[PDB]
Symmetry: D2
Amino acid sequence: SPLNPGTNVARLAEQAPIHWVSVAQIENSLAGRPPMAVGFDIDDTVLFSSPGFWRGKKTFSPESEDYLKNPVFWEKMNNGWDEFSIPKEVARQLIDMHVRRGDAIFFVTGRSPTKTETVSKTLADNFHIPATNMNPVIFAGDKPGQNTKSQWLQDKNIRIFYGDSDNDITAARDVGARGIRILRASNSTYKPLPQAGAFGEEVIVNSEY
Amino acid sequence: SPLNPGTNVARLAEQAPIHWVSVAQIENSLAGRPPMAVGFDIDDTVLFSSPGFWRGKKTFSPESEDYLKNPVFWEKMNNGWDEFSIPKEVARQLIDMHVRRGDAIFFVTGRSPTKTETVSKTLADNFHIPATNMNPVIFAGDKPGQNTKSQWLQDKNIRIFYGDSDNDITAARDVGARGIRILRASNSTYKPLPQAGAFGEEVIVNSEY
Amino acid sequence: SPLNPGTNVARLAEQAPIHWVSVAQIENSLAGRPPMAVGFDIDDTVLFSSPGFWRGKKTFSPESEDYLKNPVFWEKMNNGWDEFSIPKEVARQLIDMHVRRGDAIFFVTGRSPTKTETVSKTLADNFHIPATNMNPVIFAGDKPGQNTKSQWLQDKNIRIFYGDSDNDITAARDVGARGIRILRASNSTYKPLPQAGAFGEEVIVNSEY
Amino acid sequence: SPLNPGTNVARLAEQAPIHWVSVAQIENSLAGRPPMAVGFDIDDTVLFSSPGFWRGKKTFSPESEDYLKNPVFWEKMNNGWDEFSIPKEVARQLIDMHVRRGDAIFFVTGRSPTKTETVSKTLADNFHIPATNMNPVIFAGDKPGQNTKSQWLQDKNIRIFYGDSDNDITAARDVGARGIRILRASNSTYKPLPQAGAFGEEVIVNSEY
Ligand SMILES: Nc1ccn([C@@H]2C[C@H](O)[C@@H](CO)O2)c(=O)n1
Ligand SMILES: Nc1ccn([C@@H]2C[C@H](O)[C@@H](CO)O2)c(=O)n1
Ligand SMILES: Nc1ccn([C@H]2C[C@H](O)[C@@H](CO)O2)c(=O)n1
Ligand SMILES: Nc1ccn([C@H]2C[C@H](O)[C@@H](CO)O2)c(=O)n1
Ligand SMILES: [Mg+2]
Ligand SMILES: [Mg+2]
Ligand SMILES: [Mg+2]
Ligand SMILES: [Mg+2]
């Protein structure tokens, strides 16, 4: 592409028509609503867990995505590799806000279920989630052709679902819940990045970290 | 204010929590709604009229804002200096869209009223507004015999009001109309620029030109 | 195009590889250099003169660019329509800086020469340019196939040339002068906007106003 | 910190005066130059190693920065925790470009030295660095028996040094090498982010991933 592409002020100022929101705006929108269930995606929503998925790929399938169907990978991923996962600031702020509200907090992930998992502990510890707000992580798995999260959102009566992927937002849509998008960091190993805002949903500002 | 201030990617990626919308999205939101009255502020909403205001300030009050109280200025500004005003593309798109809907187009301005005005003609001609959708400019304000912008919005049953200033949005909200913000161009002489989105209202993307 | 196009943080943070500079950085780069000749383009560099060109087009050739070859247009443009031209802040700052330096200031424009012109006066007055730094505007004209500015930059020994158009920067290149780009405002009627930085030249930050 | 802070187009279009460059532009600047030594900082320059530093801080000093002085941490960090570090694309492109030139690739780190290290292997493997271009990581610093980064750049005749921290740029400048800045990712745990461009140096676009 051109050595010196240049730019112009129409481009510099250009904004995609995205419904951006802040955590404060979300909290304000909920003012006075009693405790309810809310849910969070995990990967690239509350944890930058690319370190573990990157290790998994290099270890289990350097040339493919097969590691994601490998039980030996999931056993490592769910039982300690989140020691290297970096909690997202947007998640600290959202989880603190939902604890303030007295909301029930659920995590619903496309990760595969394993025999044991330490992920619930990592989340409760890192985010300072009290026992009463915390719920064990739901490992909904990944099955092409099905949104495995939708039925879980329904079963737990989740009213807000935060996530980075299109299927997080459409899971919320499927059940009539409010789907709010978090930006996936640009150094995530899960590419391409989704188009945040592509269902006209709210997207949290500065939510890449 | 360092010579080399530098930057960082948090700053570079930072977004204000604005509800950005497009003309297409606004149109979509009105699908199936019958013809209705809509209204526009003039200055920095549909016309970049700073050229006449710049000339007016230079000619009539170079050291103050007194020109805005000078009938000699307004007679000039409302009877031909808009030949030098630059129509905004955002306004061309909105007015085309509303005309296509069969909506009534109103312009409500805080410009001081004059004996005659040719601003209505300028607007109909520049924006190709059909006679059936066109309405003579309304001069609203707080002088004896005048009615306020809010009062005129109620009178004409204006359901959507477009403008760049805080007072355009509040005038709409006070009567329960939908106030939609247009960005004031950075080379406008009316400074400082407003904080578009300051009341949580919709702001049209790229609406500075 | 899509109703809800969305975005992602790689896009939000993306920067074109442009050599951006500030006026302070330019002045610093010149520290200790004795008085020299410098030159400025006029339209969209020091004056937002779109009001006059817009009036000219609508008056003289609503359906074409023929007004730009019409002597009756130029006579109006160069003898008063700049009363509506809005001086650029970047130009105030650059002209003040060159006056500080004791530099000779030239304006070299692609506007056509007329029998009389009041543009030199408008510039000296609006920018507070002292007699000794000021020089009468050079109306170099426009002739496809020739950069009419290059020979003028050579004749006046201009060492820095500021401008918004590609031919301003290449005029400076032609003569071995330092060509520095100003951003053309997005509400200029001269479209399309140039790609600032496309010759790897310095571009002044925030220079659209 | 208003609930609805709004924005304006001056802010939206605002650019810091940074000398942005691309990898293509850097390569172009070296055209015809024979093979030379170039060097890279490691952390947040070529590896997003925050996962290991995050784990290290949690494990060894949750309430302080003491882990960076703890030999037990460094033995872990330099002997396998980089399996969880994420290579930066900007580094893949730069290292490919320099390898293609036949340049010598050096890595100079302020990480504390350890009895053994497998970081050199991680870097050669991840970046596909041929044995003829590869050099074992240099641990530079101010401990007895060590030499500083500046000293190592002189020793190896490193002509270009890439890094994200101020000290990477100053170490280059102190010995007359070309210091080129890479953006630290916003989800790095090393905070605050540096002001890339703080010394007027080149900064690589989009170099946060
Ligand atoms: N420099 C400017 C530009 C626009 N306006 C607005 C638009 C109306 O014409 C006028 C109403 O007083 O003020 C202004 O006050 N000053
Ligand atoms: N959280 C972090 C991340 C990186 N570094 C840098 C990179 C080197 O590994 C180390 C040198 O002390 O510090 C750090 O100090 N702290
Ligand atoms: N590089 C990858 C690939 C997948 N996943 C996540 C998203 C899915 O929900 C789950 C199974 O694919 O793991 C991830 O975080 N990073
Ligand atoms: N819409 C336009 C068209 C032209 N010009 C300028 C640039 C040229 O130098 C000169 C003759 O075209 O006028 C302008 O400012 N605006
Ligand atoms: Mg996810
Ligand atoms: Mg207005
Ligand atoms: Mg010009
Ligand atoms: Mg570093």
